[PDB]
Specification:
This protein is α/β, with parallel strands linked by helices. It has 2 domains: 280 residues, no CATH class; 103 residues, no CATH class. 25% of the residues lie in helices and 21% in strands. It has 11 helices and 21 strands. The strands form 6 sheets. An 8-stranded mixed sheet has the order 7-6-8-1-9-19-2-20, sandwiched between helices. It has a 5-stranded antiparallel sheet with strand order 12-13-16-15-14, with no helix packed on it. Helix 6 runs parallel beside helix 8 and helix 7 packs antiparallel against helix 8. The protein binds zinc ion (2 copies). InterPro entries: Alkaline_phosphatase_core_sf, Phosphodiest/P_Trfase.
């Protein structure tokens, strides 16, 4: 039988957290296999746009998942907890790896992965779940274990897994916190038990592993939250999203009015017309992107006024969603298996390239994507 692919995301694991003695199992995974120095997220450096980049090889700007939170005249609103929008296929552009795996008559098993609850291009994974917070570490790890072990023509060629606990630890206390490091150990620990259980099940040697994060993490010092209204007053323009990438739409007759006040630079943020965003971000053309886009500077948030008053008064926190070239925003990429190289290190690379690699490990044709196949050929054992 051909070798299965286990794709693991650790949400918000930053590229340098592999080097702090707090990741015994993942460090050993890199000893055994391949570790990129870092992997750069796409713009914007949030969960849904990047997870869905990884699995399609497309920039957010082309796949259409352009924020965690979006509107679309035709399809309506979109946010992470809006289950009828997340599980609605018209939002999700291109073809993610599980669709491609299914269409060759092999099988995909998704614990969680953004897009995996929708029938994208008419196709849903062979195994899947609705997303629920609080699901126990052991719970998700034993179904993944099961889903690799299953045999015959109901064998799973792709198993995906997702961990939200680091990102969540990095929001409430920041990336240098005791909590963050502890959450990193807790997930690393759970990856240990997975790998160990795979061995006892005799699936370890049969299975190729890729471990990624969707972005890094930046420290937000206490009191560094302003209001999105400190950027643009309501009667001018509406804040479409808050956090760090703050979209604005002009009120029907303030189109010009809005441009003065918002555009250009300010103490803790900058704003551009969407078609003039920094060219290096490759973002601005998808229709769904609101008309002005403000990027908060590293370590500052802009929040909805009602979200401003509930904010943790005191407390060092964290965010991401910042300039995806920033070193704080760098993600992880490691990989190990029978079909991957041993001992090796790769340079820093763009997260659009992961797809071509995965498409080769899943015996599927790579759909047209924004990445370059050459970047990750050196991860392989073969040519
Ligand atoms: Zn994330
Ligand atoms: Zn997050």
């Amino acid at each position: 039988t051909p070798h299965a692919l286990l794709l693991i995301s650790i949400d918000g694991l930053r590229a340098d957290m592999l080097d702090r003695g707090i990741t015994p199992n993942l460090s050993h995974l890199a000893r055994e296999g391949v570790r990129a120095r870092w992997m750069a997220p796409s713009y914007p450096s949030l969960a849904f746009p990047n997870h869905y980049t990884l699995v399609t090889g497309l920039r957010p700007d082309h796949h259409g998942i352009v924020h965690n939170s979006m509107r679309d005249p035709t399809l309506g609103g979109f946010w992470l907890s809006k289950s009828e929008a997340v599980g609605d296929a018209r939002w999700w552009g291109g073809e993610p790896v599980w669709v491609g795996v299914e269409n060759t008559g092999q099988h995909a098993a998704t614990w969680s992965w953004p897009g995996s609850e929708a029938a994208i291009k008419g196709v849903r994974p062979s195994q899947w779940r609705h997303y629920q917070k609080g699901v126990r570490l052991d719970t998700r790890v034993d179904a993944v274990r099961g889903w690799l072990a299953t045999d015959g023509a109901q064998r799973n060629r792709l198993v995906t897994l997702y961990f939200e606990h680091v990102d969540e630890a990095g929001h409430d206390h920041g990336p240098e916190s005791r909590q963050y490091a502890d959450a990193v150990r807790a997930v690393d620990a759970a990856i240990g038990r997975l790998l160990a259980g795979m061995q006892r099940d005799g699936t370890r040697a049969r299975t190729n592993i890729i471990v990624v994060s969707d972005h890094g993490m930046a420290e937000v010092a206490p009191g560094h939250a302003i209001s999105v209204e400190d950027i643009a007053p309501p009667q001018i323009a509406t804040a479409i999203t808050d956090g760090q990438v703050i979209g604005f739409e002009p009120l029907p007759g303030q189109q010009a009015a809005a441009e003065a006040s918002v555009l250009g630079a300010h103490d803790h943020y900058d704003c551009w017309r969407k078609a003039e965003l920094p060219a290096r971000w490759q973002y601005g053309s998808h229709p769904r992107i609101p008309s002005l886009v403000c990027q908060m500077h590293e370590g500052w948030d802009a929040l909805f006024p009602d979200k401003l008053a509930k904010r943790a008064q005191r407390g060092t926190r964290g965010s991401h969603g910042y300039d995806p070239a920033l070193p704080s925003m760098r993600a992880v990429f490691l990989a190990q298996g029978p079909d991957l190289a041993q001992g090796k290190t790769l340079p820093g690379f763009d997260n659009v390239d992961v797809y071509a690699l995965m498409s080769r490990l899943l015996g599927i044709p790579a759909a047209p994507n924004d990445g370059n196949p050459a970047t990750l050929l050196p991860a392989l054992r073969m040519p």
